[PDB]
Amino acid sequence: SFKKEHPLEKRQAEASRIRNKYPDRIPVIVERAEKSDIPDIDKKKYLVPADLTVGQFVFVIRKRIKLSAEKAIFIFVRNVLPPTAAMMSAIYDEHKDDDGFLYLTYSGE
């Protein structure tokens, strides 16, 4: 729904500004995966350190959605699980959207 709520024109322009001003960070849109039974997330736009790993970003989501650690969280990009050890800069480089943002989804088990 991020894409539905913001025209492609405006998405592209905001991504260009952020990449110019904060080159050591990655603009990420985070949304809950379709049909997932875990909590929706309040804020969708995250400016992430390039060196942050996927696994470390799982902890970020956990703190927002206030999910007990007994229950697992998985991050997807383009419907596939990226490696936990991968740095956000790498996922961006390889899977960034045409609008300049990286789109992530998350779910539980």
Binding site: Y46, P49, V60
Partner: peptide
Amino acid sequence: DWEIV
């Protein structure tokens, strides 16, 4: 506004 991690 952006969330900053």
